[PDB]
């Protein structure tokens, strides 16, 4: 279980791309841009 | 709506009212169509429900009360079209088309735009009333003429305030506790409950025919 | 792993600390080499570039890992502090045009 | 200007079949029974060509 | 006189029969489903110990309700009196509309037949039509469907066709043998479909305009009219019939479609036989409804332009036919029909339409054989090995028809045992394939094997990508399941899985002649080319291609055509469709001279 501390603390943001089985991950680029 | 164990359980005329709106030749309602009168056998009749101010009409749309042919029977909106059309005819050989219906006459219903007849249906444990094309007589019964009607008197079917008191107190029952056994007490009050809906009352004779006349 | 990805389509995390700027990259639960450091005061937008090969091309799962603080707690301040994944109506996909 | 180019060898080809209609129209009008005016055409059509 | 009947025959609803009464009544479909089992059962067809001693009701309540929906047809208004708006047909309309529902029509146009069967004998056990469904029955329904309900909107339009007709029409195909030719089956299913089913589909016509996103089937009707067309029983007023049915229908499709049917024509047209009229016409009033298609290099704004493979066989259609011509004898007609047609043809083909050197190798000599019909060949593939660099493919792909097998016993309920009753359901094989024996491999290894030489016949170049080689470095149960919800196959790559997936129906084809040969004959409703199936009969092929050319992709082995282009002189002015049309000309017109000299 995550500290409940560190996590109202912390500054670090998450998110995730599930690229779809059988979609080409040689032409999928995932980051960030301004 | 039950009227036979009236005197075991009042029927709800209130709903069960229907007035004569128009009543024109067949080819007249064509023209009309396509563009204080004594009822005559064969013509076709408009009916307003007297609560709703709509109009009985074939619905075009059938419960499935196990007759694939029939149509509901319900109200609608408009007088437009031939839907809320029914035609009135003679049930035995004493009438004629072209006579003059009587208060006392059966009749059957054929609505113009689906040459139904206005049915009873037994299909279900219930009894339904739908559009088939099996035949029931119907007793059309006087229940009030406007014409005949005075202002100012009591008539059956009214619903009214009984003014006890100096003009000031109403015969009404207590307000909205949430509670219905605490509502179902009767007394009497004043004050803003006069032009409040839970201090009228509905004056029911106990008549099925004529139960709109003049209360002596 | 190469090649055999229908046991699960790629999963790959994007983790932004903003107190230091790195930006990491986590693939099918392994950090990857690969990393920023951008300037104070940097706004990113949440990005994916992808050419259709496929039906469904991909997604925007907006759920969390251990230790890390969720997209929407630091896209909206008045969920600043919520632990709990949330997608606003606010949030939405653009593209460029 | 949309394409089309018929090469130098296809125009050959067109003035010597033209040339060659020619020469079988050359006094067989009676020959070819009613259909001398199916050559003219040709020869007219293609002439224009 | 229609409005008097219908009114009279709605007040008495007793003259409906037992099942269109009104209560209780099963409908009409469902009536027609009494009396098809009535037909077959001998205690309530018969007086219980031909028509005029043993009639039979079987086929008289069909015959009723048949003639009950003539009349409720027949009475219907003419449609002007709808168009302009006439209160009282629309409401008799309406009344007959609401008598007979829509889907209690469609599903008895839907109603299969019985078809005659052959011996071992030879002779033709063709089954009484004085007892069972009659073609005549289904009628009826076709007429109801014009006059009261109306055919007016394309879903419905192809909806209908798929579940009634195509069904109808391909039991028509069997019957176009030399034996059933002359069946009563025959001379009823044609009067049939030659005046109330395909006149229908003269009139919806134009509702077969937009309808590009259905291939399978519009290019299926064309091949189960067109091969049923060159029957022999077939009258002289039917043959004109289904002549104009199929101009109609041709006249408003996009030219991709016409492919498969042009695929057929370009070798039966060269013949130039009294068949080939029809043909001919269909060819020309294509060829001038759609020429930019073919001419212009853009092509209608909408429908396109050419692929390069109609462009092709135009090409030598145009060429057989003209050589054909200059080696057939003079008759009036054929020349009248036929230079219209070379003309069209001509003028639809580029001038300068790029003769390409790559001519199209193994051109199709199976199905369209004339007597038999179906010759199937698919390439001999024992000669070729597979190699053991690609066992290791086999057996991966094994492991993933393990993995489909396994997915449907986890939906089916099989229970862990140590024996195989096929009774109580258990099976011993929830193990993984590792664990499976060689022989219960080789129900997957056989046809992995079979498939990879269908593909290796060809010459099929199969190179393994370096993630297949990394997949070779890669080297109380958790299971998984392959998840493809999201591959797709290039364009190319797809057409050249329609011909492999028709290679796979010819061998299925193949093996369904043998055991018909077992069978003495009769051909099946589904035994016809891969060009005549639907779509939905079209299922197994697609699946058998789809998931093996998807999952060699996703193992890392890539293949290509049968081998590489041989040459291309591109810069050859001496290759347009110009420079041997103009040769071809000037031969003939200086033999012509050499004649004319003499």
């Given at each position: ?5 560190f996590?109202?603390?912390?500054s ?23 | ?52 101010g ?30 809320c ?19 006392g ?112 | ?68 603080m ?28 | ?49 | ?51 005029d ?42 009344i ?24 071992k ?19 009826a ?22 579940v ?56 299926s ?129 580029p ?10 190798m ?22 070729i ?94 299971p ?65 291609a ?6 060699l ?12 282009d ?19 000309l ?13």
């Amino acid at each position: 279980r995550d500290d409940y501390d560190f996590l109202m603390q912390t500054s670090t943001y998450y998110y995730s791309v599930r690229i779809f089985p059988g979609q080409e991950p040689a032409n999928v680029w995932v980051g960030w841009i301004t | 709506e039950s009227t036979s164990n009236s005197k075991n359980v009042p029927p709800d005329l209130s709903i069960c009212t229907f007035v004569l709106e128009q009543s024109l030749s067949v080819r007249a309602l064509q023209e009309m169509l396509a563009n204080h009168r004594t009822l005559l056998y064969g013509h076709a009749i408009l009916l307003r429900h007297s609560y709703s101010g709509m109009y009985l009409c074939c619905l075009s749309t059938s419960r499935s009360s196990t007759d694939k042919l029939a149509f509901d029977v319900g109200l609608q909106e408009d007088t437009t079209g031939e839907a809320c059309w029914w035609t009135i005819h003679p049930a035995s050989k004493q009438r004629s088309e072209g006579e003059k219906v009587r208060v006392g006459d059966d009749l059957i219903l054929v609505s113009v735009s689906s040459e139904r007849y206005l049915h009873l249906s037994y299909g279900n444990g219930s009894l339904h009333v739908d559009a088939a094309f099996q035949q029931t007589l119907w007793s059309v019964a006087p229940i009030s003429s406007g014409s005949e009607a005075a202002q100012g008197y009591l008539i059956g079917g009214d619903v009214l305030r009984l003014l006890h008191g100096h003009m000031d107190e109403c015969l009404t029952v207590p307000s909205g506790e949430h509670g219905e056994e605490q509502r179902r007490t009767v007394h009497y009050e004043g004050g803003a409950v006069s032009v409040h809906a839970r201090s009228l009352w509905r004056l029911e004779t106990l008549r099925v025919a004529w139960s709109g006349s003049h209360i002596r | 792993p190469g090649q055999g990805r229908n046991n699960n389509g790629l999963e790959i995390g994007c983790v932004v600390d903003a107190a230091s700027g790195l930006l990491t990259f986590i693939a099918n639960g392994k950090e990857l080499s690969t990393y920023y450091q951008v300037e104070p005061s940097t706004k990113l937008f949440p990005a994916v570039f992808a050419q259709a090969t496929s039906p469904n091309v991909f997604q925007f799962e907006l759920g969390r890992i251990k230790n890390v603080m969720p997209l929407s707690a630091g896209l909206f301040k008045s969920e600043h502090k919520n632990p709990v994944p949330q997608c606003p109506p606010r949030l939405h996909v653009q593209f460029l045009s | 200007c949309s394409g089309g180019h018929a090469s130098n060898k296809e125009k050959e080809m067109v003035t010597s079949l033209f040339c060659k209609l020619g020469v079988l129209v050359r006094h067989r009008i009676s020959l070819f029974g009613n259909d001398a005016t199916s050559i003219v055409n040709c020869l007219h059509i293609l002439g224009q060509t | 006189n229609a409005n008097v009947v219908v009114r009279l025959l709605i007040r008495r609803p007793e003259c409906f029969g037992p099942a269109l009464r009104g209560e209780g009544g099963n409908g009409l479909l469902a009536a027609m489903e009494e009396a098809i089992k009535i037909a077959e059962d001998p205690s309530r067809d018969g007086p219980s110990p031909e028509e005029d001693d043993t009639i039979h009701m079987g086929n008289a309540i069909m015959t009723f309700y048949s003639a009950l929906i003539d009349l409720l047809g027949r009475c219907a208004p003419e449609m002007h009196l709808i168009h302009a708006g006439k209160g009282e047909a629309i409401r008799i309309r309406s009344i007959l509309r609401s008598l007979i529902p829509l889907g209690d029509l469609v599903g008895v146009i839907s109603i299969a037949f019985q078809m005659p069967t052959i011996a071992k004998d030879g002779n033709v056990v063709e089954p009484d039509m004085s007892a069972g469904f009659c073609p005549d029955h289904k009628a009826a329904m076709v007429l109801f469907l014009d006059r009261v309900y109306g055919i007016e909107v394309q879903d419905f339009l192809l909806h209908l066709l798929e579940v009634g007709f195509l069904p109808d029409l391909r039991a028509a195909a069997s019957l176009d043998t030399a034996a059933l030719s002359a069946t009563d089956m025959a001379l009823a299913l044609n009067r049939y479909l030659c005046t109330a089913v395909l006149p229908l589909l003269t009139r919806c016509a134009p509702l077969f305009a937009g309808t590009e996103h259905h291939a399978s089937l519009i290019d299926s009707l064309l091949h189960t009219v067109y091969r049923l067309s060159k029957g022999c029983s077939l009258t002289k007023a039917q043959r004109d019939s289904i002549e104009v049915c199929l101009l109609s229908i041709c006249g408003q499709l996009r030219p991709s479609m016409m492919q498969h049917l042009l695929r057929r024509l370009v070798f039966d047209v060269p013949l130039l036989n009294e068949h080939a009229k029809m043909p001919l016409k269909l060819l020309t009033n294509h060829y001038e409804r759609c020429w930019k298609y073919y001419c212009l290099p853009g092509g209608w704004g909408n429908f396109g332009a050419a692929s390069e493979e109609e462009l092709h066989l135009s090409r030598k259609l145009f060429w057989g036919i003209f050589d054909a011509l200059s080696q057939k004898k003079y008759e009036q007609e054929l020349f009248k029909l036929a230079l219209p047609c070379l003309s069209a043809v001509a003028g639809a083909l580029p001038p300068d339409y790029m003769e390409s050197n790559y001519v199209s190798m193994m051109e199709k000599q199976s199905s369209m054989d004339s007597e038999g019909n179906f010759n199937p060949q698919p390439v001999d593939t024992s000669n070729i090995t597979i190699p053991e660099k690609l066992e290791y493919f086999i057996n991966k792909y094994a492991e993933h028809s393990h993995d489909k097998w396994s997915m449907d016993k986890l939906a089916n309920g099989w229970i862990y045992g140590e024996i195989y009753s096929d009774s109580s359901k258990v099976q011993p094989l929830m193990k993984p394939y590792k664990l499976l024996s060689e022989k219960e491999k080789e129900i997957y290894r056989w046809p992995i094997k079979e498939s990879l030489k269908t593909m290796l016949a060809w010459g099929w170049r199969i190179e393994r990508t370096r993630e297949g080689d990394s997949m070779a470095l890669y080297n109380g149960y958790s299971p998984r399941a392959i998840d493809m919800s999201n591959v797709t196959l290039s364009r190319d790559l797809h057409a050249m899985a329609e011909m492999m997936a028709e290679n796979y129906h010819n061998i299925w084809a193949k093996k369904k002649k043998m055991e018909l040969e077992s069978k003495g004959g009769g051909n099946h409703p589904l035994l016809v080319p891969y060009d005549t199936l639907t779509a939905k009969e079209k299922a197994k092929d697609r699946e058998k291609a789809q998931d093996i050319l998807k999952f060699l992709q996703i193992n890392g082995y890539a293949v290509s055509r049968g081998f590489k282009d041989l040459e291309l002189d591109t810069p050859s002015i001496e290759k347009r469709f110009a420079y041997s049309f103009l040769q071809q000309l000037i031969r003939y017109v200086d033999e012509a001279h050499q004649y004319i000299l003499e």
